[PDB]
């Protein structure tokens, strides 16, 4: 907002970033914390070393990261990491080639000084907006500063998006062709089988209906099963096995596993000699699991299955085709990876999928609109001042009236941060509730929902008023589009410095916390001191997890939209976008080459989604600048309207020319170089659900 | 407009319809005109008779037409006729079930008499609108007359559209499964092959690239060729053969074929003994055609081909799949019928197709907007009064000042009717210019363009002003959507009687002229007296042609939109819509069972398009009534806004649940009952282009 607050926030973020980098560089060199700072290269083969020798050259990572091509990344991590890095590089190139023509636009915005004029009539001032945005009359010479800049932005964005989207398609094709025998090229996913086997069993029905269609190309079809009870039993058995393995970790005296600690127990006398207490439970669980498996593999298998062909071409062409003359049944989709499909979420009819999709999307919109109200209600509770229930009361008033005056303000921060923390998981679960028979697809849907929510949160909370219900009711009863666009244009230059300082804060704090891995550091050390006792537990204690593409991508794209929407309004933030995406490229390269381990392949499927939302952000920027040059009287329409049409046409052309190659594997790459005859039962045991594994 | 003009026009249309039906019923009974009134049943097998005996029962056709189920129509004509009749029956059912609840709505519109009040303040009056539309205050009890009627319309439309769309899918599946060995189930259409065979020939490249993909399933691929010159030579040779056959028709004396009559000739002395003059030309044409064929089948075949598999399943699944990892090349589409694909229009790259599509659509929009200006310029020419060039001048003034005072007004009618006559062919050609590798697809595109043009012609020429350029400029500089919808609502009740009388005119005149076939009657009789001399020429002189689904469907759907948009505004026209579609059902049943012969199968592909535009018309009706109840103050939003959302959702659901079954044949119906082993060269000779037929 104000210059002083902006400087204070920027300096604070810079200081925290500096101290975090110093901590990271002083602590990474210790060999005791290698498993948490290089969890990759220690689970993947064995490369725990600094890279060359015992002596670690200072700065320790920029040389290693800056000399790693996309081939190295694809060799180490999945192709999805490569397409994410293409995203970072592409937006960096857009921002840098835009900064190449940033140089003039600043000059008229400083030479002309209409902010100084009587337009202030004795809020929108920080001595910084004096340099960026509003130092132009209603009708002065803004040709170079407005049209000659939006044309440059659009041209560089189109060029970079086209070239990058082509490059991602090339990477996908190159990786897909040069593959091995993976148990995904051989299968499809039928999930709308007609309910009645009309007097027979469902599996025999599936097998007969597909053997009549594809003779000589069939192993046999695995049918989805109601895995609820058997899944629960197998989870309990695995927990019992892990607890028993933990029990013998002491190996010194007899064990005593606490029972009252579990909460819903009181058998303290049975804690001693837990070996028998766990072996009997294991035997009972094994018997129950065997009976449950025998029941579930024969009692009412549900109406969905996977199918296996004996030739990659047959599966690659039988997944894109149409089976039944009516399309509401026998729906066929390409079978995902064994670790990327959702058995529980699967087996949902088409109408149920549509109904769930609409209800979940409507609920997401309802939450987006009514977000603030429950937060305000939770903040308004007596919890603000709970002095009546303070047990210690040693010196609360002294410590809260001196420096803790923000605790009363801290509680609404708590009521908000709890929701922000739970939100990614909630959105992922809601996306998984729409039927989404692919967990990568669920990740994409959750990312889209989170990005939309973040935009409609930040933009509404900055430009317009904070009464969202009143705002939407008014705009419902307000005159139509033209003055709405005028308001959109006029409200943005209210305070760009807030966006500057928010970009700086996210930049410095987020990247410091990420590269430092300080939270995983503390958690790992505490757990090493905590309950974790056996080497098996600690070996699985520091597992890195995926790149978390369900929340990194929406945050990065939110910053992308922030950058474009003010790209030439207040062209100062172009530097901030450049530095954000540059440090992101560097830090994420070091991370995805040293710490993160993927959970998918997805062969770059995220990139059409990323491209679509980047183009949407560019289109929104074009509309915003159209409105702004509507405000400042100008040759408004004849500058941006053809270019908005061009954006729409370019989107359609990009889809029509490359989107087809991302949805399906191609037959030209589905018969390339089969050398070793593919196995038969290995693919099954890849798609056999983990609970129903030990069987015959 | 006025009551008198409305009555005069309706009576005139009724009288012309009556006299035309009397002429048709008096003349159809003559056996001399059987080939023109029953061209079907005389080309298809042999059924020229009245049906039972020599004595023709009066009314002669209603009993025969009313006792013909869809099975009979499919046996005689193609399934496309059946889906067209389902269209007529469905809209008839919608209109009739709406007339079932028409009964109350008229009563308040007559009991309440606000038109009589001072709102007229000493144009929108014909004593008929006193009964229909505007006899309601701004805020009286319009609940039953407005909301309780639009809900009924929407419910009956949804029910009928759903049931009918299901029934069309059922007919398509039943006809497709119970088929024979047709040379279309065996082929696909590759039309984006990469240009270079990099030092080889294109045909060998296609064959190698597809033999590497589909071993053991391949006849060989026919590659498209530059058929311009060879097509021209073959057309000239066919014309020469027909002329020679006509020459020997006299068979009495020596022939004398005129040469100066051709226009670009003066060899009158060579007219005698045209037998040699034509045999020498035939021999030269045969030699030139053989040389041209030998050249074209080997010299630079273009970059597109058709492919033939040896199993219907392989073709049905290899047409919906993706071949090359990049989708811009090796595009695969289901091969159309031998008579329904366009060799000349084929072989166009994807970018060229997109560019041509956008330019043609933009040109269509430009013509739609600037339509009237060239018509006005042509009307303004001196041609209105050409007295200076009147050669006879026997008594022009006497005959033009008595009853021909409308000749000066007739000339603009000429300048308009010429464009209306040429327009369907122009639109079909423009649609064929977008690449459209299927002539049925071109028919659909031309129908869509014609329907849009007709709507934007009639609605603009009735409600708003006639200065389209000024209107669009104003609305560009006019305030936004809300008042535009208010104007849409307020301008419709200006004169509904014009729409009543236009529906009556189209009804009576069009159906009388159609069933009478008076124009084909006169043309056939004149040609029988005219140049046509041999029996072969006359046998091909009365060929009926197709059902002309490129102009019947848009006209019928234009009347459908007219009916809905005023369905409860002025509920009188519901009777007119009912009678129009009922007489259409009757007349078109008699025609398509007795006169018309199809040129396609298309297996009901038109019906998704018809359904989409019917739903669009219903949505436009909902928007219109939303605006109208905005005008008359009412519970406007909470009545129609959820229902507009419902219309959008219903469209999406219908697409997702049935549209898949219309685009492709299914594998379940692609291996049903192969009894006789399919031929090999027969399918080729079905797809061999007519010019390149005689070869080796």
What would the 3-class secondary structure string for B477-546 be?
A: HCCCHHHHHHHHHHHHHHCCHHHHHHHHHHHHHHHHHHHHCHHHHHHHHHHHHCCCCCHHHHHCCCCCCC
Residue B285's closest CA among B244, B331, B338, B334?
B244
Torsion angles phi and psi, residue B548, rounded to 5:
60, 55
Q: Answer yes or no: do B668 and A176 touch at CB < 8 A.
A: no
Q: Mark B24-39 as b/e (b = at least 16 C-beta within 10 Å).
A: bbebbeeeebbbbbbb
Between chain A and chain B, the number of residue pairs with CB atoms below 8 A apart is: 128
**Side-chain-facing half-sphere of A624: CA atoms under 13 Å:** 24
Is B605 in CB contact (< 8 Å) with chain A? no
Is B358 in CB contact (< 8 Å) with chain A? yes
Q: Answer yes or no: do B482 and A481 touch at CB < 8 A.
A: no
Q: Answer yes or no: do B330 and A668 touch at CB < 8 A.
A: yes
Element (H, E) at B612: helix B606-631
Q: Answer yes or no: do A656 and B321 touch at CB < 8 A.
A: no
Please name the method used to determine this structure: cryo-EM
Is A646 in CB contact (< 8 Å) with chain B? no
* The 3-state secondary structure of A505-561, one letter per residue: HHHHHHHHHHHHCHHHHHHHHHHHHCCCCCHHHHHCCCCCCCCCCCCHHHHHHHHHH
**Chain B residues close to A317, C-beta within 8 Å:** 317-318, 321
Cβ neighbors of A214 (< 8 A, separation 6 or more) are: A309, A314, A318, B313
* Look-up of token digits 């040759």: A635
A492: DSSP letter:
G
* Look-up of token digits 């040609």: B527
| B255: three-class secondary structure by DSSP | coil
Residue A226's closest CA among A300, A337, A331?
A300
**Chain A residues close to B212, C-beta within 8 Å:** 671
Distance from CA of B636 to the nearest CA of A (A): 13
Residue of B nearest to A330 (CA): B668
Handedness of CA B473, B478, B480, B484 (dihedral sign): negative
Is B674 in CB contact (< 8 Å) with chain A? no
Distance of CA A166 to the CA centre of its chain: 23
A363: DSSP letter:
H
Domain boundaries, chain B: 3-182+459-665, 228-296, 350-434
**Side-chain-facing half-sphere of A90: CA atoms under 13 Å:** 26
Strand positions, DSSP E, A161-257: 187-190, 222-223
Residue A187's closest CA among A689, A686, A521?
A686
Q: Answer yes or no: do B653 and A354 touch at CB < 8 A.
A: yes
Residue of B nearest to A478 (CA): B482
Query: Which tokens sit at B276?
Result: 């040699």
Contact B339, B431 (CB under 8 A): no
Indicate the residue of B209, B330, B354 with minimum beta-carbon distance to A656. Answer: B354
Residue of A nearest to B352 (CA): A653
**Chain B residues close to A482, C-beta within 8 Å:** 479-480
Handedness of CA A516, A517, A519, A522 (dihedral sign): negative
Indicate the residue of B173, B354, B358 with minimum beta-carbon distance to A325. Answer: B173
Torsion angles phi and psi, residue B45, rounded to 5:
60, -130
**Residue B61 and residue B68: Cα distance in Å, rounded?**
11
List residues bridging with A272 in a β-sheet: A256
Task: Name the resolution in angstroms.
Answer: 3.8
Residue of B nearest to A482 (CA): B480
Q: Mark A23-40 as b/e (b = at least 16 C-beta within 10 Å).
A: ebbebbeeeebbbbbbbb
Is B330 in CB contact (< 8 Å) with chain A? yes
Q: Answer yes or no: do A350 and B661 touch at CB < 8 A.
A: no
B256: DSSP letter:
B
Contact A296, A229 (CB under 8 A): yes
* The 3-state secondary structure of B336-356, one letter per residue: CCCCCCCCCCCCCCHHHHHHH
A134: DSSP letter:
S
Contact B354, B450 (CB under 8 A): no
Is A327 in CB contact (< 8 Å) with chain B? yes
B189: DSSP letter:
E
Is A322 in CB contact (< 8 Å) with chain B? yes
Is A671 in CB contact (< 8 Å) with chain B? yes
**Chain B residues close to A177, C-beta within 8 Å:** 325
Query: Which tokens sit at A445?
Result: 């849907």
Q: How far is CA A108 from CA A117, A140, A310, A621, B56, in A?
A: 16, 11, 68, 21, 92
Residues 290 through 319 of chain B touching chain A, CB cutoff 8 Å: 313, 316-318
Is A658 in CB contact (< 8 Å) with chain B? yes
**Chain A residues close to B646, C-beta within 8 Å:** none
Distance from CA of B212 to the nearest CA of A (A): 8
Residue B555's closest CA among B594, B516, B513?
B513
Is B673 in CB contact (< 8 Å) with chain A? no
Residue of B nearest to A354 (CA): B653
Q: Answer yes or no: do A213 and B313 touch at CB < 8 A.
A: yes
Contact A528, A538 (CB under 8 A): yes
**Residue B507 and residue B576: Cα distance in Å, rounded?**
9
**Chain B residues close to A668, C-beta within 8 Å:** 209, 213, 323-325, 330
Query: Which tokens sit at B139?
Result: 């805020």
Indicate the residue of B317, B327, B659 with minimum beta-carbon distance to A321. Answer: B317
Q: Answer yes or no: do A664 and B321 touch at CB < 8 A.
A: yes
Element (H, E) at B223: strand B222-223
Q: Answer yes or no: do B658 and A213 touch at CB < 8 A.
A: no
Indicate the residue of A173, A351, A480 with minimum beta-carbon distance to B480. Answer: A480
CB neighbours of residue A53 within 10 Å:
8
Distance from CA of A312 to the nearest CA of B (A): 11
Indicate the residue of A213, A324, A657 with minimum beta-carbon distance to B328. Answer: A657
Cβ neighbors of B626 (< 8 A, separation 6 or more) are: B485, B636, B637, B640, B641, B644
Is B362 in CB contact (< 8 Å) with chain A? no
**Chain A residues close to B358, C-beta within 8 Å:** 649
Indicate the residue of B481, B649, B656 with minimum beta-carbon distance to A481. Answer: B481
Residues 443 through 482 of chain A touching chain B, CB cutoff 8 Å: 479-482
| B683: three-class secondary structure by DSSP | helix
Q: Answer yes or no: do B325 and A661 touch at CB < 8 A.
A: yes
Handedness of CA B430, B436, B441, B444 (dihedral sign): negative
Strand positions, DSSP E, A158-304: 187-190, 222-223
């Amino acid at each position: 907002m104000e210059f002083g607050s902006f400087l204070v926030s920027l300096g604070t973020s810079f200081v925290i970033f500096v101290i975090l980098m110093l901590l990271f560089t002083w602590l990474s060199r210790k060999s005791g914390n290698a498993p948490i700072y290089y969890p990759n290269r220690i689970l993947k083969g064995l490369e725990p070393w600094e890279g060359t020798s015992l002596t670690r050259n200072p700065f320790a990572w920029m040389r290693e990261a800056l000399t790693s091509s996309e081939q190295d990344v694809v060799n180490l991590s999945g192709v999805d990491t490569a397409v994410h890095f293409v995203f970072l590089s592409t937006v960096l190139g857009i921002f840098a080639c835009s900064s190449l023509l940033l140089l003039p636009t600043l000059l008229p915005l400083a030479a002309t000084d209409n902010n100084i004029k009587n337009t202030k009539n004795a809020g929108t001032f920080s001595q910084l907006d004096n340099l960026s945005m509003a130092n132009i009359t209603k009708k002065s010479s803004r040709l170079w500063a407005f049209l000659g800049a939006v044309y440059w932005i659009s041209l560089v964005t189109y060029f970079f998006l086209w070239k990058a989207y082509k490059h991602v398609s090339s990477l996908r094709a190159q990786a897909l062709m040069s593959a091995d025998v993976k148990p995904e090229q051989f299968a499809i996913l039928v999930r709308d089988m007609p309910a009645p086997p009309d007097g027979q069993t469902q599996k025999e029905f599936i097998d007969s209906y597909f053997r009549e269609i594809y003779p000589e190309t069939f192993y046999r079809s695995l049918v989805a099963t109601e895995n609820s009870k058997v899944n629960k039993i197998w989870e309990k058995l695995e927990g019992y096995k892990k607890k028993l393995a933990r029990a013998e970790a002491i190996l010194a005296a007899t064990n005593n596993r606490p029972t009252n600690k579990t909460g819903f127990c009181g058998l303290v006398g049975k804690q001693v000699d837990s070996i028998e207490y766990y072996t009997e439970l294991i035997n009972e669980s094994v018997a129950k699991l065997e009976t449950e498996q025998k029941a579930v593999l024969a009692e009412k298998q549900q109406t969905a299955a996977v199918v296996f062909f004996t030739t990659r071409v047959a599966a690659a062409s039988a997944a894109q085709s149409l089976h039944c003359q009516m399309v509401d049944k026998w729906t066929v989709t390409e079978a995902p990876e064994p670790r990327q499909l959702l058995w529980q979420n699967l087996n949902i009819k088409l109408f149920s999928r549509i109904i769930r999709q609409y209800f979940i999307n409507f609920f997401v919109a309802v939450t987006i609109l009514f977000y603030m109200i429950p937060i305000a209600f939770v903040s308004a509770i007596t919890t603000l001042k709970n002095l009546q229930r303070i047990i210690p009361f040693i010196k609360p008033v002294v410590e809260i009236t001196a420096i803790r005056t923000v605790l009363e303000s801290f509680l609404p921060q708590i009521a908000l941060i709890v929701f922000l923390a739970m939100l990614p998981k909630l959105l992922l679960f809601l996306s998984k509730a729409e039927g989404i028979p692919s967990q990568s697809h669920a990740i994409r849907a959750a990312s889209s929902k989170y990005f939309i929510f973040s935009v409609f949160n930040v933009f509404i909370g900055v430009t317009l008023a904070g009464t969202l219900f009143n705002t939407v009711k008014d705009i419902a009863k307000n005159p139509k589009l033209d003055m709405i666009i005028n308001l959109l244009a006029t409200s943005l230059p209210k305070s760009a410095t807030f966006f500057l300082t928010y970009v700086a804060l996210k930049f410095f704090i987020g990247y410091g916390l990420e590269l430092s891995r300080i939270i995983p550091l503390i958690i790992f050390h505490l757990k090493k001191k905590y309950l974790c006792k056996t080497e098996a537990e600690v070996k699985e204690a520091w597992y890195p997890g995926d790149l978390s593409y369900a929340t990194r991508v929406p945050g990065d794209m939110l910053i992308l939209t922030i950058t474009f929407c003010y790209s030439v309004i207040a062209p100062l933030i172009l530097i901030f976008g450049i530095t954000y995406f540059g440090l992101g490229w560097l830090v994420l390269r070091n991370q995805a080459l040293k710490v993160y381990v993927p959970s998918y392949e997805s062969y770059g499927r995220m990139w059409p989604h990323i491209h679509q939302r980047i183009l949407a952000a560019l289109f929104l920027f074009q509309v915003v600048m159209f409105g702004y040059l509507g405000a400042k009287t100008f040759f408004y329409t004849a500058l941006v309207i053809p270019l908005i049409i061009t954006s729409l046409i370019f989107g359609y052309v990009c889809r029509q020319k490359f989107y087809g190659g991302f949805e399906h594997t191609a037959l030209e790459v589905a018969c390339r170089e089969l050398k070793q005859s593919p196995d038969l039962e290995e693919i099954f045991r890849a798609y056999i659900p983990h609970s129903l594994s030990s069987h015959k």
